[PDB]
Amino acid sequence: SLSDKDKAAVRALWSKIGKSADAIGNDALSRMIVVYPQTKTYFSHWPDVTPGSPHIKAHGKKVMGGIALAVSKIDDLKTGLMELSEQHAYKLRVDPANFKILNHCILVVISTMFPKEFTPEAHVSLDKFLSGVALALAERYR
Amino acid sequence: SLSDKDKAAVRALWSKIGKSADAIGNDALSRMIVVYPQTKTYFSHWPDVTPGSPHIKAHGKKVMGGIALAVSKIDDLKTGLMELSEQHAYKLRVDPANFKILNHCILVVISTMFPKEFTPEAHVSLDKFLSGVALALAERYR
Amino acid sequence: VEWTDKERSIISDIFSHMDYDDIGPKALSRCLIVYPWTQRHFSGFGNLYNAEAIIGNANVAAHGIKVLHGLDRGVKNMDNIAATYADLSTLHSEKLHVDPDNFKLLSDCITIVLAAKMGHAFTAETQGAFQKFLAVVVSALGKQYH
Amino acid sequence: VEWTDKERSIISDIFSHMDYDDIGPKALSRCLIVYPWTQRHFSGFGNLYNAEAIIGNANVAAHGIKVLHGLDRGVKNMDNIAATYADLSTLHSEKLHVDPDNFKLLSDCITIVLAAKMGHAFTAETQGAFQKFLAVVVSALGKQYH
Numbered sequence: 001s002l003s004d005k006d007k008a009a010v011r012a013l014w015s016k017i018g019k020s021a022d023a024i025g026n027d028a029l030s031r032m033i034v035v036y037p038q039t040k041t042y043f044s045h046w047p048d049v050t051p052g053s054p055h056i057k058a059h060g061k062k063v064m065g066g067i068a069l070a071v072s073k074i075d076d077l078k079t080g081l082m083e084l085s086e087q088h089a090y091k092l093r094v095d096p097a098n099f100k101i102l103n104h105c106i107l108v109v110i111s112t113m114f115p116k117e118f119t120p121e122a123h124v125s126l127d128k129f130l131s132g133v134a135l136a137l138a139e140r141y142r
Numbered sequence: 143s144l145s146d147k148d149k150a151a152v153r154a155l156w157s158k159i160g161k162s163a164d165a166i167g168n169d170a171l172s173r174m175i176v177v178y179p180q181t182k183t184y185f186s187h188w189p190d191v192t193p194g195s196p197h198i199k200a201h202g203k204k205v206m207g208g209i210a211l212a213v214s215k216i217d218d219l220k221t222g223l224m225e226l227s228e229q230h231a232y233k234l235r236v237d238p239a240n241f242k243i244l245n246h247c248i249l250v251v252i253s254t255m256f257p258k259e260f261t262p263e264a265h266v267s268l269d270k271f272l273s274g275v276a277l278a279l280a281e282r283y284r
Numbered sequence: 285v286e287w288t289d290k291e292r293s294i295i296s297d298i299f300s301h302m303d304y305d306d307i308g309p310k311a312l313s314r315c316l317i318v319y320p321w322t323q324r325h326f327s328g329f330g331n332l333y334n335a336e337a338i339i340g341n342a343n344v345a346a347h348g349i350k351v352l353h354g355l356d357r358g359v360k361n362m363d364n365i366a367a368t369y370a371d372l373s374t375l376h377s378e379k380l381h382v383d384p385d386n387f388k389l390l391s392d393c394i395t396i397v398l399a400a401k402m403g404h405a406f407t408a409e410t411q412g413a414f415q416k417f418l419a420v421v422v423s424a425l426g427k428q429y430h
Numbered sequence: 431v432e433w434t435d436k437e438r439s440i441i442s443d444i445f446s447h448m449d450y451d452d453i454g455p456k457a458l459s460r461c462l463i464v465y466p467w468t469q470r471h472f473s474g475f476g477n478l479y480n481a482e483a484i485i486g487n488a489n490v491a492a493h494g495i496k497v498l499h500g501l502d503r504g505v506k507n508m509d510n511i512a513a514t515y516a517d518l519s520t521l522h523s524e525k526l527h528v529d530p531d532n533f534k535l536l537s538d539c540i541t542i543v544l545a546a547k548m549g550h551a552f553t554a555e556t557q558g559a560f561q562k563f564l565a566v567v568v569s570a571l572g573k574q575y576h
């Protein structure tokens with residue numbers, strides 16, 4: 001569970017880096033599909049699946065807007081992300097294993113772009129938060 | 143999270159198998175250290191670490207005693223297992239990955255001992271339950 | 285991997301007695317119910333809306349037996365498993381688009397269904413050898429994902 | 431493990447520019463903060479109840495430099511990494527009692543600290559190769575746990 005300390009740390013960090021959400025998604029999703037190519041199975045319906053492609057780019061925006069939502073719903077991620085959970089559970093059927101992979105990629109992208117803001121304390125709290133985002137997206141799966 | 147249907151399935155199953163908790167615990171820790179020998183690192187202070195030993199037998203009692211606690215506390219595992227969580231966090235420093243290993247071994251144990259009772263529907267709910275127990279035990283970690 | 289003679293023995297033993305028409309359906313049904321996102325691939329299998337539809341679904345049944353018999357080539361090739369499965373791997377990646385983490389999940393279900401069948405005979409050492417074999421098979425199935 | 435010439439060059443170039451004195455303490459520091467059960471093995475280094483307390487601990491800083499130097503032998507022995515790390519593996523398991531999952535966790539922390547130091551030079555392909563290397567060393571470190 002997230003403490004007040006965690007919540008504060010995530011909101012301060014997002015306050016600082018949110019402006020870069022779209023760039024962060026493109027980067028993180030590009031990293032995911034390059035470094036963990038098995039994740040490409042979920043994008044078999046796109047024309048192609050390549051780093052920084054139009055489709056990866058636009059999705060990267062949408063995924064990080066989902067993270068934006070989660071920061072705003074941080075006091076109740078289960079309720080806050082229920083529609084996204086329904087989509088991921090019933091339409092996409094993304095194995096929750098993959099959320100851990102993207103989460104790692106997000107942390108690496110933020111380290112590369114925000115070295116000074118992404119402190120070990122920022123990192124423990126964001127890692128806790130993303131694990132909670134992953135669990136909330138998994139809420140409607142079984 | 144656990145639904146009322148999940149909670150009822152875990153309670154009905156534990157009602158059926160709980161009188162063999164001690165045996166369950168022996169068997170599961172025995173499987174854990176044989177099949178996943180890296181877990182033996184946490185028991186380096188014991189005289190030895192071998193299946194069915196008196197130490198494994200007593201530890202199994204204690205562990206499944208914890209599962210019985212979690213069943214009684216199923217409506218709020220976070221609160222219910224906080225004291226146990228602080229023990230694993232500060233005193234024992236057990237990496238949360240190992241809870242996943244021992245949960246699998248418990249499911250294998252129960253399947254062997256109660257194949258009629260351990261239906262797929264029982265399994266999905268108990269798995270959700272054990273993942274919740276694992277998460278609750280990590281509550282005081284970081 | 286480097287097998288011990290006892291491990292070879294245990295695996296050969298399990299597979300000699302494997303009731304595939306029984307274990308196969310049970311394991312895939314259980315997987316579909318415990319890990320319902322694995323149903324992604326079986327929309328043409330008909331009704332899966334609940335546990336009962338799945339357990340009663342003859343298409344899942346036949347596919348379970350098939351997957352289980354897919355392990356046979358590894359038993360017959362214990363020192364060549366990664367190459368023996370290269371084409372199956374490529375199949376699951378390029379044409380079926382199956383998420384390879386799903387393999388792990390199915391594996392665990394198989395292990396738990398076999399544990400139900402063998403009971404007391406599914407000793408810790410038997411489980412060790414069996415999961416080791418399944419882990420080596422699963423690695424090989426996920427190998428050709430590019 | 432089959433390495434590509436591009437993977438060899440990437441890994442080679444990373445360890446020739448890396449400042450062990452900067453990265454080692456930060457990566458070990460970050461791990462004991464993000465994954466505090468790794469503190470299991472650093473009893474008498476003084477008080478580690480605090481991130482400031484951890485990041486200023488001299489004993490942690492010196493161990494993070496040691497671990498990072500432990501990577502050198504794998505760079506030197508890229509096609510024989512399991513064997514190179516066997517006695518180190520045996521030490522971690524039988525003498526130190528280090529849970530090997532901790533190896534993966536420190537690995538990720540090293541990756542993240544390197545990423546903050548390299549910036550946009552830590553490309554997707556660079557991360558791939560670097561994580562590939564750490565993964566093979568980590569598997570090695572875990573091999574002799576019996």
Ligand code: HEM
Nearest residue numbers: 039042043059062063065066067084092094098099102103
């Ligand atoms: C941090 C975790 C992630 C969040 C917050 C997230 C966010 C979202 C959201 C907001 C959308 C809906 C887009 C729209 O408006 O149409 C989306 C769609 C989807 N996401 Fe996720 N996602 C997560 C992780 C994943 C993972 C890791 C993958 C694949 C491995 C995945 C695969 C998909 C796919 C395939 C769709 C549909 C996109 C399309 O049809 O083009 N998501 N997700």
Ligand code: HEM
Nearest residue numbers: 181184185201204205207208209229234236240241244245
């Ligand atoms: C299903 C999850 C688990 C339950 C509910 C649980 C429960 C327990 C209980 C009730 C105690 C006794 C605390 C006391 O001293 O009063 C205990 C201690 C301990 N547990 Fe856990 N535990 C679980 C998983 C494990 C795992 C996965 C490991 C490591 C692989 C671990 C390692 C230990 C150790 C080393 C001790 C002390 C035993 C001794 O010193 O002899 N726990 N646990």
Ligand code: HEM
Nearest residue numbers: 322323325350351353354355372375380382386387390391
């Ligand atoms: C131990 C793990 C598994 C093994 C050894 C295995 C093996 C098999 C084999 C032998 C076939 C037949 C190839 C063909 O007819 O072209 C196949 C088909 C297939 N497998 Fe797997 N499989 C594994 C797990 C998975 C999982 C977990 C899923 C998805 C949840 C799955 C989805 C399917 C599908 C969709 C096909 C094609 C079905 C059809 O169109 O008839 N497989 N697999």
Ligand code: HEM
Nearest residue numbers: 468469471496497498499500501518526528532533536537
């Ligand atoms: C990337 C993985 C790591 C590598 C390459 C590495 C390698 C090594 C090496 C080269 C030594 C010196 C052994 C000797 O004196 O002969 C050492 C010792 C040790 N390492 Fe590891 N290490 C790794 C991860 C860790 C982790 C994750 C832990 C703790 C959480 C750990 C705990 C220790 C301890 C307690 C010692 C004993 C130091 C001494 O007293 O000399 N190591 N490490």
Ligand SMILES: [K+]
Nearest residue numbers: 007072074075
């Ligand atoms: K709030």
Ligand SMILES: [K+]
Nearest residue numbers: 149214216217
């Ligand atoms: K109640």
